[PDB]
Amino acid sequence: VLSPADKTNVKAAWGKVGAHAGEYGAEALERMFLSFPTTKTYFPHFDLSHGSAQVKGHGKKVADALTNAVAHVDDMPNALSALSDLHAHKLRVDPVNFKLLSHCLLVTLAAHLPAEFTPAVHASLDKFLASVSTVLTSKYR
Amino acid sequence: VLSPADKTNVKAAWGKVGAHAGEYGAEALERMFLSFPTTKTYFPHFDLSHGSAQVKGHGKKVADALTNAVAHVDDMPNALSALSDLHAHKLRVDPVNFKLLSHCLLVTLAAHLPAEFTPAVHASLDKFLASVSTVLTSKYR
Amino acid sequence: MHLTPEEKSAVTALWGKVNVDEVGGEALGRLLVVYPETQRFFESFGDLSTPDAVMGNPKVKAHGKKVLGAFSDGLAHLDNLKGTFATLSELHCDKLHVDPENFRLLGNVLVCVLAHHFGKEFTPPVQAAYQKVVAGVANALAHKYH
Amino acid sequence: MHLTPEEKSAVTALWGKVNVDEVGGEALGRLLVVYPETQRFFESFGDLSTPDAVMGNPKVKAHGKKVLGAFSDGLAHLDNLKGTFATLSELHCDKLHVDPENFRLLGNVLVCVLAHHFGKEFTPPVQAAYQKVVAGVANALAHKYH
Ligand code: HEM
Numbered sequence: 161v162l163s164p165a166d167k168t169n170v171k172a173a174w175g176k177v178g179a180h181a182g183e184y185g186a187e188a189l190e191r192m193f194l195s196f197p198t199t200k201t202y203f204p205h206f207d208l209s210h211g212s213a214q215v216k217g218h219g220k221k222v223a224d225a226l227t228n229a230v231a232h233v234d235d236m237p238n239a240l241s242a243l244s245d246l247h248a249h250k251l252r253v254d255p256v257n258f259k260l261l262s263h264c265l266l267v268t269l270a271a272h273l274p275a276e277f278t279p280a281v282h283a284s285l286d287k288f289l290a291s292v293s294t295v296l297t298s299k300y301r
Numbered sequence: 302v303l304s305p306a307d308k309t310n311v312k313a314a315w316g317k318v319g320a321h322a323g324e325y326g327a328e329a330l331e332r333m334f335l336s337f338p339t340t341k342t343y344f345p346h347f348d349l350s351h352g353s354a355q356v357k358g359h360g361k362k363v364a365d366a367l368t369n370a371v372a373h374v375d376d377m378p379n380a381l382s383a384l385s386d387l388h389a390h391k392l393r394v395d396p397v398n399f400k401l402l403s404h405c406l407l408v409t410l411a412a413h414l415p416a417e418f419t420p421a422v423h424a425s426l427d428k429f430l431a432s433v434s435t436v437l438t439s440k441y442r
Numbered sequence: 443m444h445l446t447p448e449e450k451s452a453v454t455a456l457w458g459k460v461n462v463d464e465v466g467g468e469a470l471g472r473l474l475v476v477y478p479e480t481q482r483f484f485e486s487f488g489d490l491s492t493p494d495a496v497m498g499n500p501k502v503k504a505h506g507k508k509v510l511g512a513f514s515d516g517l518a519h520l521d522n523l524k525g526t527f528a529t530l531s532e533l534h535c536d537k538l539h540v541d542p543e544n545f546r547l548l549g550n551v552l553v554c555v556l557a558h559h560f561g562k563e564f565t566p567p568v569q570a571a572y573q574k575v576v577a578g579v580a581n582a583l584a585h586k587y588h
Numbered sequence: 589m590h591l592t593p594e595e596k597s598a599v600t601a602l603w604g605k606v607n608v609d610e611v612g613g614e615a616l617g618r619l620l621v622v623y624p625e626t627q628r629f630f631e632s633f634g635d636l637s638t639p640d641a642v643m644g645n646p647k648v649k650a651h652g653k654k655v656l657g658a659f660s661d662g663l664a665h666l667d668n669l670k671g672t673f674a675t676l677s678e679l680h681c682d683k684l685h686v687d688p689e690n691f692r693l694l695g696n697v698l699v700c701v702l703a704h705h706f707g708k709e710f711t712p713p714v715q716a717a718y719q720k721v722v723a724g725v726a727n728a729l730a731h732k733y734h
């Protein structure tokens with residue numbers, strides 16, 4: 161469960177990401193494809209070379225979804241309802257992969273947010289991605 | 302999520318279990334300790350030898366908490382309120398370990414109730430225990 | 443494969459009494475039913491709507507046999523699982539696109555299946571032994587993922 | 589431990605610029621703040637209630653150093669982690685009773701910290717190596733568990 165502090169922490173941290181979100185999402189994704197090769201089995205139709213337009217593209221898409229969750233941090237289940245249905249009925253991604261991507265977002269944000277990636281935030285960000293993950297994974301069976 | 306058919310499959314399967322509950326609980330526990338040794342680190346105060354008083358009584362407790370969960374299948378978070386506070390604030394068992402008990406229960410059941418372990422019941426049983434796991438870890442952070 | 447001699451033996455002996463045709467079918471079968479997400483990979487097998495269809499589905503059964511058949515060969519190569527499943531691996535990764543996370547699911551479904559057919563004879567010690575093969579077999583299959 | 593010359597180079601190359609005393613402190617303290625449950629093993633470190641209490645705790649820092657200390661000894665023996673960490677494994681198992689699962693939490697946090705300290709320099713390719721490395725150590729610390 162996110163606490164009042166946790167939320168403030170996510171909004172402040174996310175706010176600083178600002179117009180770079182898209183740029184970050186892609187990197188998050190590329191760090192993922194590299195460190196955890198298995199995750200690629202979900203993207204056989206994707207061109208996975210460094211600097212790929214589909215990766216930049218999906219990158220933005222992931223960052224927009226996340227941005228929207230921060231926008232509706234008090235009602236995420238209904239905010240992401242759409243995305244949840246997608247991943248549970250069409251994509252059918254195994255839950256562990258969500259932890260991998262989450263971990264990769266953390267590295268990515270920590271590589272660009274020196275001053276803001278404080279312990280307290282790292283803890284709040286880690287909980288939020290866990291929430292986003294649990295929602296997207298909620299209707300699996 | 303538990304559908305009405307699952308709830309019914311669970312109530313039946315567990316009904317047949319009857320007075321062998323604790324005996325199955327202890328068995329699952331044993332199966333777990335032998336098959337997935339890392340899980341022993343949570344019971345360093347227990348005599349872990351074959352069929353010993355501690356594993357037995359403990360298996361009886363686990364079994365009975367399950368009985369109570371079936372009987373309250375429609376209200377698990379409230380009926381398990383306490384066990385959830387306990388595993389979350391005091392025992393602090395890493396979630397992974399919960400799947401290992403469930404699979405072990407499943408094996409135990411499957412080995413003792415041949416006629417009932419149908420593919421439909423196996424399934425429901427799996428979704429059942431998976432839910433009892435979330436409820437027991439829902440207050441981790 | 444850190445299999446104890448008395449473990450290797452526990453494994454081997456029990457396998458020899460296995461009906462490959464029934465066990466294979468019930469394994470693959472139960473996987474699709476218990477973990478529907480895995481159906482994504484078999485949409486070409488046909489009617490996977492209901493438990494009864496799946497377990498009765500001939501294409502399901504036949505593959506269960508082919509699958510348990512490859513398992514058998516690993517039980518005979520326990521010392522070099524990696525080398526025995528290298529092909530099957532490049533194949534499940536380079537052409538089939540299966541998240542190796544699913545292997546484990548099949549592994550546990552299988553363990554249930556044995557416990558289901560052998561009851562008493564599937565004792566805790568024997569299960570542990572199998573739990574080890576199932577993992578060993580899963581890693582070998584994921585071994586060449588890139 | 590499938591580590592290529594280029595990966596190992598990166599790994600070692602980067603580690604050369606790391607202040608073990610400092611990085612360790614951050615790493616263990618963050619593990620104690622990002623995954624509170626892990627405090628269960630350090631009730632004798634005193635104040636762990638709020639972040640500053642953790643990050644600032646002089647025992648948390650002293651211990652951090654210790655851990656990261658042995659972690660370097662591993663990089664100097666990437667070819668035999670299981671041997672290097674054998675006694676340490678029996679320890680975390682027999683005496684401390686630490687669920688090996690926790691070894692990966694620390695690892696991933698470690699990765700996060702390196703990222704914080706090096707920014708851009710920590711390129712995707714460099715992180716994949718460390719992911720391999722940290723996993724390696726975790727598996728090695730878990731090997732003597734029984
Ligand atoms: C226990 C570990 C497994 C083993 C040893 C195994 C082995 C095999 C074998 C031998 C084949 C036949 C290849 C051929 O005939 O050319 C095959 C095909 C296949 N396997 Fe696996 N398998 C395992 C688990 C899985 C699971 C978990 C999945 C996904 C749920 C999967 C997905 C597939 C698919 C989609 C095919 C192609 C079948 C076809 O349409 O012809 N396998 N597998």
Ligand code: HEM
Pocket residue numbers: 626629630654655656658659676679680684686690691694725
């Ligand atoms: C790179 C991963 C890790 C390494 C290399 C490592 C290594 C060590 C070392 C060298 C010691 C001191 C040895 C001694 O006292 O004789 C130690 C102690 C200890 N370790 Fe680890 N450790 C790691 C991760 C963890 C994790 C994640 C935990 C718990 C979640 C943990 C739990 C403990 C505890 C409770 C002690 C005793 C501390 C005391 O009271 O002095 N270790 N560990």
Ligand code: ZNH
Pocket residue numbers: 199202203218221222225226243246247251253257258261292293296
């Ligand atoms: C947080 C975390 C996350 C998030 C937020 C997300 C989100 C998302 C989004 C927004 C999208 C878009 C779609 C449309 O079109 O609309 C997607 C999709 C998606 N997705 Zn997911 N995801 C995720 C994770 C994930 C993972 C883990 C995976 C596996 C690996 C995935 C896989 C996916 C896929 C495959 C897709 C599809 C795309 C294409 O195909 O194009 N994913 N996704």
Ligand code: ZNH
Pocket residue numbers: 340343344359362363366367384387388392394398399400402403433434437
């Ligand atoms: C199904 C699922 C489940 C359930 C229902 C349960 C339940 C339970 C119960 C009932 C109890 C009793 C408490 C009192 O006192 O009252 C317990 C305890 C308990 N628990 Zn838990 N669990 C479980 C799982 C588990 C896991 C998995 C683990 C890990 C391995 C555990 C660990 C535990 C511990 C450690 C304890 C305590 C111990 C003693 O006795 O001290 N657990 N638990």
